[PDB]
């Protein structure tokens, strides 16, 4: 069954859910970091989920690897595309659990990676830092990627700063399209930015790992820094029309240790090749200052 497993340190508390690994709170003190979870199982109406073993969608759900294509089916009924992995859509198991750290693993045996995967987490009083290393446990190579898909508090007053040197424009499907080396102005977070108050589903390249969520309103930032440097990052905000319970209250700011649609570039992009055994990891730290 659904377990929450709840860790502190200080005025900072977090609460993860075994259903889909997903963080369902991030708090100083009743002030939430992350957007509260409905702890409803529902890996999108959480704070934060893991991508796992790799980020986002692979356009017409099939990718040649090393000589062989590989078809992947639909994982949600509401998308056409496999998306997101697996992780965020299964039962984790629960294998340490302190005051101030937790780890879940994982173990997928179907479909067309067959891997495990750890999340640990760790709480100091002012940092929250997520670690996924994943195994390839599969008869062949193929390439892997992680990532992080958390959800922020949005107000008017919130700003954000996150290198890129251009990004790919959204096509039909919510796929990636073409790239753009011209950022617009609405969508260029080189300096601190509002977000639109408008759909937006886009994935930036030549970021360095690292970004700044300024909470003005709130007299706070979170500093998010990645290890290794996450290459690319998409920014989600909703819309009234897709989501009619959607009142412009939270966005997303996901690292991804890879480009949407590596799949299809030469030896993968910036996915990592796993032979059978192999494995890697990345680190996603939020630190919380005074703005």
């Known amino acids: 069954g659904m377990t929450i497993y709840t860790l502190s340190h200080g005025s900072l508390k977090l609460d993860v859910s075994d259903q889909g690994g997903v963080i369902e709170g991030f708090w ?15 890996a999108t ?13 692979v356009s017409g759900n099939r990718f040649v690897w090393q000589g062989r294509e590989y078809q992947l089916q639909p994982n ?3 998308d056409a595309h496999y998306l997101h992995g697996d992780g965020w859509l299964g039962e984790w198991q629960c294998v340490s659990h302190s005051d101030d750290s937790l780890c879940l693993v994982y173990e997928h045996r179907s479909g067309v990676y067959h891997y495990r995967v750890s999340q640990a987490f760790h709480l100091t009083a002012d940092t929250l ?27 008017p007053q919130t700003r954000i700063q996150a290198q890129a040197s251009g990004y790919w424009l ?63 990052y998409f920014i989600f905000v909703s819309d009234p029309a ?46 919380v200052e005074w703005l």
Request: hydrophobic share 35%; glycine share 8%.
């Open 170 to 232: 959204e096509r039909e499907q919510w796929l990636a399209g073409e790239f753009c080396e011209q950022l617009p102005q609405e969508l260029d977070f080189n300096q601190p930015a509002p977000l639109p108050r408008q759909w937006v589903n886009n994935g930036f390249a030549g970021w360095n790992g690292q970004a700044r969520i300024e909470q003005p309103q709130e007299g706070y930032a979170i500093i998010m820094e990645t290890t290794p440097p996450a290459p690319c």
């Open 129 to 155: 830092t997520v670690t996924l290393s994943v195994t390839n446990q599969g008869a062949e190579t193929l390439p892997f990627g992680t990532g992080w898909h958390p959800y922020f508090p949005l107000s």
């Open 45 to 57: 109406d959480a704070s934060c989920f893991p991508l796992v073993p790799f980020a986002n969608r």
């Open 242 to 287: 897709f989501d009619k319970g959607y009142a412009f209250d939270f966005f997303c700011l996901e690292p991804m240790s890879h480009a949407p649609d590596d799949h299809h570039r030469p030896e993968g992009g910036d996915l990592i090749a796993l032979a059978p055994g192999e494995s890697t990891t990345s680190e996603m730290s939020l630190r």
């Open 28 to 42: 100083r003190d009743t002030t939430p970091l992350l957007r509260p979870g409905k702890k409803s199982g529902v």
């Open 76 to 78: 949600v009924e509401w």
